[PDB]
Amino acid sequence: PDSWDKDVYPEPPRRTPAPAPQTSLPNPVTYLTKIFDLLVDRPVTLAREFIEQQHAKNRYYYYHREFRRVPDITECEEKDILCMFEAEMQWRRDYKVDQEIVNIIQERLKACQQREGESYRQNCAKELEQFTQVSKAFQDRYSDLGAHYSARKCLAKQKQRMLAERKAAKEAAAA
Amino acid sequence: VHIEPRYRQFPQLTRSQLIQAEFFSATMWFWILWRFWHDSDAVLGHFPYPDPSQWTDEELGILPDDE
Amino acid sequence: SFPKYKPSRLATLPATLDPAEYDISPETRKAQAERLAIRSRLKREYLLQYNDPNRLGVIEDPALIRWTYARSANIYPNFRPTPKTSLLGALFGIGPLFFWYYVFKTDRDKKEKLIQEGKLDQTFNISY
Amino acid sequence: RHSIFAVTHVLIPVWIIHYYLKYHVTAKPYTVVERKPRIFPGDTILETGEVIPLMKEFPDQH
Amino acid sequence: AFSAPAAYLTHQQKVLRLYKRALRHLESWCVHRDKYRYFACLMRARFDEHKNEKDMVKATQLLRQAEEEFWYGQHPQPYIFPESPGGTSYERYECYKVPEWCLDDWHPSEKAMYPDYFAKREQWKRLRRESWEREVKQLQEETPPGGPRTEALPPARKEGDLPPLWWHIVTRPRERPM
Amino acid sequence: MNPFASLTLTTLTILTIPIMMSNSNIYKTNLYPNYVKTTVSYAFTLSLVPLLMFMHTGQEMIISNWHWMTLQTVELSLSFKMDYFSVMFIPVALFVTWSIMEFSMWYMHSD
Amino acid sequence: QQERDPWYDWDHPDLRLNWGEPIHWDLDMYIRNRVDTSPTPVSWNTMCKHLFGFVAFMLFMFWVGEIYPSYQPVGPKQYPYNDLYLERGGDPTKEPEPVVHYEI
Amino acid sequence: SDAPPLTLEAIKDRVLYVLKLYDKIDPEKLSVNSHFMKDLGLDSLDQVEIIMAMEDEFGFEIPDIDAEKLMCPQEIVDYIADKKDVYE
Amino acid sequence: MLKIIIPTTMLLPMTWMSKHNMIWINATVHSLLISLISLSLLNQLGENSLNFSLTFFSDSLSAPLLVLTTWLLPLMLMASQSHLSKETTTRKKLYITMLILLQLFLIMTFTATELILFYILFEATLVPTLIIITRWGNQTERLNAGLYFLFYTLAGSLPLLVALVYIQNTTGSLNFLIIHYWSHPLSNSWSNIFMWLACIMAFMVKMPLYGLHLWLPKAHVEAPIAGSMVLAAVLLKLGGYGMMRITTILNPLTNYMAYPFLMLSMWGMIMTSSICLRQTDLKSLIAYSSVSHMALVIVAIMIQTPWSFMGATALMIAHGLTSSMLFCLANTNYERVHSRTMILARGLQTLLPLMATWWLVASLTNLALPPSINLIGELFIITASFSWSNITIILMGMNMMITALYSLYMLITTQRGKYTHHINNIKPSFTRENALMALHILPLLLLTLNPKMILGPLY
Amino acid sequence: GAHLARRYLGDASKEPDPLRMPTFPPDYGFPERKEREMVATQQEMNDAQLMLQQRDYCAHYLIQLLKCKRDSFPNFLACKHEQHDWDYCEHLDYVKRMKEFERERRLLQRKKRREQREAEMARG
Amino acid sequence: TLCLGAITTLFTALCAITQNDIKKIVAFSTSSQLGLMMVTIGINQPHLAFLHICMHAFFKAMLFMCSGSIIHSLNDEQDIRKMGGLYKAMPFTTTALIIGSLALTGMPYLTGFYSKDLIIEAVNMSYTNAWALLMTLIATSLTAAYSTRIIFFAFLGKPRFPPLVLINENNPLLINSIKRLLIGSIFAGFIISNNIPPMTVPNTTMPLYMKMTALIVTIM
């Protein structure tokens, strides 16, 4: 349905084969699904129409809260408590959003694995690659901070990684 | 169905239990015979097992011990 | 004539296979009579209170009280530091701690050394 | 009184379950996932109407 | 389980106990009835072949040898009666046994049902309450100054006495309480 | 809406109704064992349908219906798998349980 | 407690204890829900040899059968598309070494 | 249902039935109050065999200490009735 | 958060102004109302804590503990009124006053923003507990128990105070927010090592750590029922809460320092679980089980990972509820038979069926049957330890076995078998005891229904 | 199997190694060999979702059998011809594998005997 | 997994053949069957193991049900040494137990055949441990051995139970349950095998002697 955006959670065009009966015998599945329709799907549908009619007469809205961008931990003086507080809250919000992005990619991966059946090892290479890239980025950003993590420790980790990369590049250039 | 003890004699039996027992043994044996008649290859095998000794050298592509 | 049975700690010797019960003496008979007299006196003492119509509650057993007290509160007053006690205490209370410390320290040193060289296959290791 | 059991113990639970799955569970992505239906040569797709060709002229090992 | 044990077993008692154990284990080995009868008659003949030995030392030596043979040749899995101490239904119905004093704790609503049963129960309780002191007096008089040597108890001897210490033997719950 | 999921969930759902009724005036009567046996038989005959659907078209499903809790990156949800193994094992177990409870009706009569 | 006489009228039948008699130091370990020391038909130290011999023999023979495996007189199973290179993990931009099978 | 409510008359009948099938005791001279050692003239092994026959008949075992004291059929039936809670 | 603190200080004069036959009713009703009010603290944020004022704040780690305390007070009130029937009115009011003061101290302890105020309240909790144990205990060893309860604590906590004031002379603040935001690494020096030990050993002795646990069997066995409930349910969790708070300043010295405590905790959980297998006293078994669970929590806090912290929080709440329920269950039988020997009263399932059902549920929750929060916390801690080192799965695994054994052992010894013949005074269970068991057990499963409320701030 | 006895008790060199086979070039003894062909396309096998092990050279008969079973669903006794064709293809594949095993065996035997004979000739 | 399954099935089958409690024999039988399933999993045939689980459920439940019927009839007696001639005294129980035993031993075209026969012939035709193969064969011989033990000691011969005969199996619940499980144990194997898609590659080329190995060891 239109409950979710179809670009964030994509699905293939869903090709399904037409029935090709080859027996004079009846199909028990078709009879049973007809009875299920007439006996279950219609009363449930009618109840849903009544519920939706009641819901339409009382329509109200809720909104997505918007957060501005404040200076990061890098633009903060050493002991400036208020700038540190704002940067820390922003960093925690971004950490939560990154966790949710990883969750979305993992949901894509699981749906692909279940959808492709016996051909999942070949038909889901792109999803596995996306998860690998996202997981590598997330692990570089946040892993090994431990409990009592903060934006300052993340910045120290990034600085250490950048220093190591600069040393490696400088040494490789001299080769 | 009321069945009383016997005290050193054979217990009483009702005709229904003998009928059911004989009928079920009979249908078991009928099913076995019918399935064997129609699906014998499920027990005796279907395709002949070849004997590799009767395979010609030319067929296997082996040189006559000279090259 | 037949292969013999050797008793052990967890498979004890049967009464009928006990040579002490086949070479008996009048002293042994007197001892058995005394044991039966003691048991009968205890049984009568118990049954007198068990069948009492006016008794409501539990019948206190001095043997159970002695058992619990000996297993709990009589141990430290009867403890003496001896070579056996000292050795067993030191072993059972020290050896496992250092054994596990050495095992865990070696394992974590190996893991850290492997991580430093960058060959541990830590891909997808998000949660810790 | 005769067939009341099939109503209070089968029909009502299936009504509740079907409503919950159709209008609440499905309203989120990737909640009910089905593996793709099998496709064989010579089949016709319902949505597109495309047909699948036959299979490379069997050597007929009769 | 009902009889008071003695201070020791006599030679004939041990002989009879070994005879019974050997017969039971031989039946365990000889499943079928005719084979068991044959070998049990053979065992009985072997057993009473030394029946007339006037030398007690040789008698005890023979008993010891017989017990060694029994322990070597016993059945590792002998037949046990289902309700015997080793049976498959030994203590099966113990959880259904409830002591009688629990009936004192019933709510008066629960006692409103079964009025005649509780009237009879009151009669029994009155009988026990009346008989207790006479039982205690009889036990005091019969017993020796040192104490009681065995666990055997005396019977009632007077006009309307009840046997002392009878309440918990007579009011056993049941063998199949539920 | 593809009754496979609805029927597979209903089969497991209706097994709990006698457990909920175990505090009513049916757990105190002598009709409780028959009530439970009838419930199991109904569950079996209902579960026979998804097996037929799978035998027809090989249909398999996963249903993640309730989101229990989510860690930072791991999401834990109440999810059921209805592949071949589940739809083949459920009717067999229900059939065996139905037979065994009907047997226990007679075997445990004096309990 | 298992070796106590079960046909005696104990004050505590399940525990097989009498009121007033001395209690063993390790009663809770011998409660007969637990460690049992009753005489066995076969001697201890004889059961041990038989059990250990069985276990060691089975282990040794399993190792022997692993180093002398059983198999049919056939060649390896052959798969069409370069051993299904794209099926077993894809990698569609490497042009692997071609695997070719011939009729015989 | 289960086994019938066994009564004292049934116990006596079965005990006597087992006793007259003992080839060493003649049926006619046997009575309910006959002492095994005095009237029938049996020794201890015969008493043991009688006790095992009773155990097989009634499907449960009597301990040896109790079994030694039973010396006439009336005691046997009384022991059986007390063991199985038989009052009628 | 004075909206919860003031009603308890009002519980005080209400108790002291009540009629002689209405104290229990008023105390129970208003304690339950206070618990309902405190339920509002569960609405926590995702980034920072609820900073009420300069003095008090609520975090996601402390709110479940506060709710547990306020819920436990009515349970102790219900449990105590049975064995205090013959007591005079003034002494009953004094007992209720001690319980109220303990709850007030715990409430103020779990929300103090400064570490020194936390220390003062966490030490003020000692006096009412000691008075309760040494005055309303039953046997003569209670006096000795009180001493073991007192000095064992103080010997651990006196150094901490020194360390605390020292820190304030170096950083200038003990406020937990400022401490967290201005954190600096600890160097590897002898001074820093001893600062670490001073900061840690008080909480270690409170858990208690294996080898420092000898006070706990004595104190928990000799105390009255309400004392045992509060000792096992909340007072042990003070050490865990304090350790989770104080570990923010001990990095990175913690990795080197923790090793002996980790080995002590693991081998000690094994040893205490083994001790539970041979125990003739029913209360001592529950005490040693508490020691084992708290050792698991110590490992969780010490390895210092987010999953370990969630596991520690969940396990602390679950253990509090379970241990209180088990102590109440044991006290019912003790009140019946006036003895603590476990083999004295057997086959109680025959006489008390619903009580046996309560016993079964409590024993099931003790051994961490899924999906109870006991199992959630235990599994999270085990996963964190496995990440720390793959060999830990051995020791933890062994614990998971032994625990179950003794738990079921307890049940099998008390409820199954045949009843003792000469014990003829097992009266039917009262409504009060059944209600106490139900009010213990229902919140556990309700919490299982929604587990994120007890998973702590790392969620 | 007799091959196991011939290898374990028999000389190891003469007998073929199941793990290491073949050891000779495919066109060694043959003047020319046809390349074995595949009927089912990779796309067809992917759509049929056969299996990673059922995608052998007999996959086309398996696809036909699966289609026939799906079409004749209530009559689960109607797909006997297609089953027989798939089984026959599998039997031919197994026979060809036996052919390859025997080829390796007799090639190893002939090669080792010829090398030993040439060495004996050159040694005198 | 293969070695563990092989040792388990052999050990349990060897323990079963000397037992005298019928419930113990059936328990060792199901333990040996579980070992056989473990062996099947060890040779990379999970679907065959699942199929064997499904087949085994029917006749194992029915065998335990018949054992319980015998136990109830003979006053809660479980030792086979006190069970005599129940072939004529208990007709329906006799035929049910005979069918269950024949299905457990893999008689052709019964429910147990369609899984056990395939498992045996898949073990014979795989690159596997030799000792595991030998132990699987010895265990599948011992299975027939202990089935013979049960039938011989429980149903053939002369009575060995106490003289108060209370045998009565004329109860509709017992008959209906056993008959339902009987129909299952007769037809379920064929019905399930023919109605399932091919998830394995069959063995179509097999030596004649190796094709009949299970039958030969069973009759031996």
Ligand SMILES: CCCCCCCC/C=C/CCCCCCCC(=O)OC[C@H](COP(=O)(O)OCCN)OC(=O)CCCCCCC/C=C/CCCCCCCC
């Ligand atoms: C991995 C860590 C743990 C591994 C196991 C190590 C050994 C654990 C030892 C546990 C000791 C616990 C003692 C307290 C329990 C209470 C005592 C008790 O159980 O009583 C014994 C009671 C009575 O015996 P019965 O024969 O039934 O007699 C009844 C008729 N009268 O029986 C028992 O419960 C004994 C159970 C002990 C099992 C210990 C042996 C297990 C060894 C496992 C090794 C094999 C590993 C498996 C390999 C498989 C391949 C992956």
Ligand SMILES: CCCCCCCC/C=C\CCCCCCCC(=O)O[C@H](COC(=O)CCCCCCC/C=C/CCCCCCCC)COP(=O)(O)OCCN
């Ligand atoms: C029931 C058991 C409870 C008992 C446990 C109590 C032991 C607690 C551990 C010892 C705490 C002592 C430390 C006190 C606070 C230290 C704070 C601090 O940082 O001071 C250091 C200094 O550290 C010290 O002075 C500590 C010295 C220790 C003196 C007291 C010794 C107490 C016993 C030590 C061994 C005990 C080991 C732990 C207990 C083991 C369990 C028995 C820095 O000061 P500066 O002089 O400025 O250094 C920088 C410039 N030079």
Ligand SMILES: CCCCCCCCCCCC(=O)SCCNC(=O)CCNC(=O)[C@H](O)C(C)(C)COP(=O)(O)O
């Ligand atoms: C199946 C495997 C186990 C079986 C093996 C068992 C082997 C044991 C067989 C050999 C046993 C013997 O002969 S041991 C022979 C023992 N010899 C004696 O006892 C001599 C004195 N006899 C008496 O005291 C009485 O006559 C008495 C006999 C007691 C009868 O008492 P009553 O007349 O007043 O009833």
